[PDB]
Design a protein around this ligand. Structure first.
Ligand SMILES: CO[C@H]1/C=C/C=C(/C)C(=O)NC2=C(C)C(=O)C(NCCN(C)C)=C(C[C@@H](C)C[C@H](OC)[C@H](O)[C@H](C)/C=C(\C)[C@H]1OC(N)=O)C2=O
Length: 213
């Protein structure tokens, strides 16, 4: 089933750096998780210009945020390109990432955290509001996998026998810090999106559970 890989040294420093941080601008994680969604959607859209058969596994292009208050979990789904087992391992590295050293040094010097995106390590910004993450992904080239991290020195990758089938794409499952549950509220999620994710090519769905009036 499961399988452990160790994070490259500097990437651990970075996660540690982020998770033990104050900063009112924590909301920017959502900005970043939505960029990645858009970038992954861009890729599959483009990819299928030369290969229409490629969109077939999940026709519609969307981003969809689901709060799950019941279990202090916020999920950001896309129908983007997705990531294979190999891609999960190399890219949620394992492999040394260029902006990483460059950014922490940037941080120490006075840099704002929202810069994280401009250093190409934006994904790790999620640890501002989460201490567990599941990246479940399903790429056309491969089976659905779960990548898990608690922000330690190593992460796990399991074949996904457990959550639902993404036609294609990726769900970010965030297990939220107890002080950061505001990101489960509709009003709040709506506020962050409207301020940061203003210019986005794809639809942004928000799943909301109403008890019957
Ligand atoms: C949550 O998962 C995300 C990935 C986490 C990535 C980390 C580490 C991140 O902090 N920074 C990166 C960002 C932001 C990029 O935009 C980016 N794009 C290419 C830029 N250039 C170098 C070619 C890269 C390089 C590769 C990792 C890209 C990926 O593997 C080839 C894929 O192309 C797909 C599209 C992945 C996504 C962007 C996200 O997937 C979804 N579905 O959300 C980054 O490293």
């Amino acid at each position: 089933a499961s399988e452990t890989f160790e994070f490259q040294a500097e990437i651990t420093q970075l996660m540690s750096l982020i998770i033990n941080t104050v900063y009112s601008n924590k909301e920017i994680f959502l900005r970043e998780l939505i960029s990645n969604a858009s970038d992954a959607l861009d890729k599959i859209r483009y990819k299928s210009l030369s290969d229409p058969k490629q969109l077939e596994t999940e026709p519609d292009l969307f981003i969809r945020i689901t709060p799950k208050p019941e279990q202090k979990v916020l999920e950001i789904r896309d129908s983007g390109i997705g990531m294979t087992k190999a891609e999960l391992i190399n890219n949620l590295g394992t492999i040394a990432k260029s902006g990483t050293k460059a950014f922490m040094e940037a941080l120490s010097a006075g840099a704002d955290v929202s810069m994280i995106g401009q250093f190409g390590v934006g994904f790790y910004s999620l640890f501002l509001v989460a201490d567990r993450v599941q990246v479940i992904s399903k790429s056309n080239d491969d089976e659905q996998y779960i990548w898990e991290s608690n922000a330690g020195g190593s992460f796990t990758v399991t074949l996904d026998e457990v959550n639902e089938r993404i036609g294609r794409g990726t769900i970010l499952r965030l297990f939220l810090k107890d002080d950061q549950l505001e990101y489960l509220e509709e009003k709040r999620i709506k506020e962050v999106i409207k301020r940061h994710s203003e210019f986005v090519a794809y639809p942004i769905q928000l799943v909301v559970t109403k008890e019957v009036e």
